[PDB]
Design a protein around this ligand. Structure first.
Ligand code: FMN
Ligand code: FMN
Lengths: 182, 191
């Protein structure tokens, strides 16, 4: 039941892990519009390269804005390996919940692929506080989108003030990290 | 532990319930920056009037964008609330994920706002209301922003705001589910 692992109606903003041979993480929206979940991957990214080669991707639900930003620009010790068929596949140690997916029906449009769930897990250890809407966290999320597009600088500058007004220390540090990264 | 009930560092966007004698709900940001949480209420609102008289307010954590927009632009009906416990009961939302009843203290005017610190009196969790895992969704986030800009459009009349609402409608349509798309329709109807 994908809903329990954060894969929900609309576009769920998660951190996608890929790379059996070298783990990689990057924010990705998984889309759910009534049928199988699917992804639309910008061509050229390591996520795109990994899905083409390996046809596997895992979702990682993350509420930490620092992790979102660091993954927009993670080292192997940050990943753990979980069962994906007879292979093991990297997910984030700090994931609240993960689902490993086989990527199917690959088609260029970006690269689009539908997702078939292989295995899923929940990390009780990782939920310490109750999630609550925070416009500062939302602002960091909008900044990472523009950062990725930039890879826009003017736009990132605006979100900074919302992150500073509404964010906690973690949102403020994440926004600092974006500024440093570019 | 307030973080267990959704009162976290920074400004937590919740729906505040107030009104011993007639329950009222409205989106409000509770601010936490190292000490007691506090609220900055715009003068003249129903939440403001109830805090002034009663000095009590409850946070309600809500992930439903429909309830956000309805509480912003409408009156929730008394059947949407339930009563929880010092002496006297106090209204919280039945659809709240988690609620905290606070005594409002140190009421002070600054600017065109009433500021109050918050001392928790009681708190609860509604297991029954968590059915899916929360996940960041830019459509939900767009609904939140659109509600802010819509209130400013009512302020100020500026077209700058209708243009922003249209951009957020676009994200709600792309990224949201059915609930977000319904929420945006309610914003439009309200305007
Ligand atoms: C919140 C957010 C959502 C994103 N969603 C997608 C997406 O669904 N598809 C995509 O290709 N890129 C998406 N991106 C952009 C990628 O995260 C970005 O290009 C990333 O840095 C690629 O890194 P990689 O080469 O390691 O895969 C998103 C970025 C942000 C911050
Ligand atoms: C996301 C969001 C956050 C808000 N935060 C506050 C706030 O913290 N303080 C405040 O006075 N009004 C805030 N508002 C505006 C009130 O929600 C709005 O004026 C509401 O209509 C008040 O209704 P009431 O008269 O029933 O109190 C916020 C609105 C939105 C949509």
């Amino acid at each position: 039941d994908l809903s329990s692992f954060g894969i929900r109606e609309g576009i769920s903003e998660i951190i996608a892990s890929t790379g059996f041979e070298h783990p990689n993480a990057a924010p990705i929206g998984i889309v759910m519009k009534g049928e199988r979940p699917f992804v639309r991957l910008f061509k050229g990214s390591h996520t795109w390269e990994n899905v083409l080669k390996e046809k596997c991707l895992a979702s990682n639900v993350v509420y930490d804005p620092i992790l979102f930003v660091r993954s927009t620009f993670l080292v192997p010790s940050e990943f753990e390996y979980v069962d994906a068929g007879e292979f093991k596949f990297p997910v984030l140690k700090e994931a609240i919940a993960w689902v490993v997916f086989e990527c199917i029906n690959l088609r260029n449009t970006s690269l689009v692929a539908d997702l078939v769930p292989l295995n899923a897990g929940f990390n009780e250890r990782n939920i310490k506080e109750l999630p609550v809407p925070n416009r500062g966290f939302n602002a960091v999320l909008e900044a990472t989108v523009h950062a990725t597009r930039y890879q826009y600088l003017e736009l990132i500058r605006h979100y900074e003030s919302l992150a500073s007004k509404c964010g906690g220390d973690a949102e403020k540090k994440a926004m600092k990290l974006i500024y440093e990264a570019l």
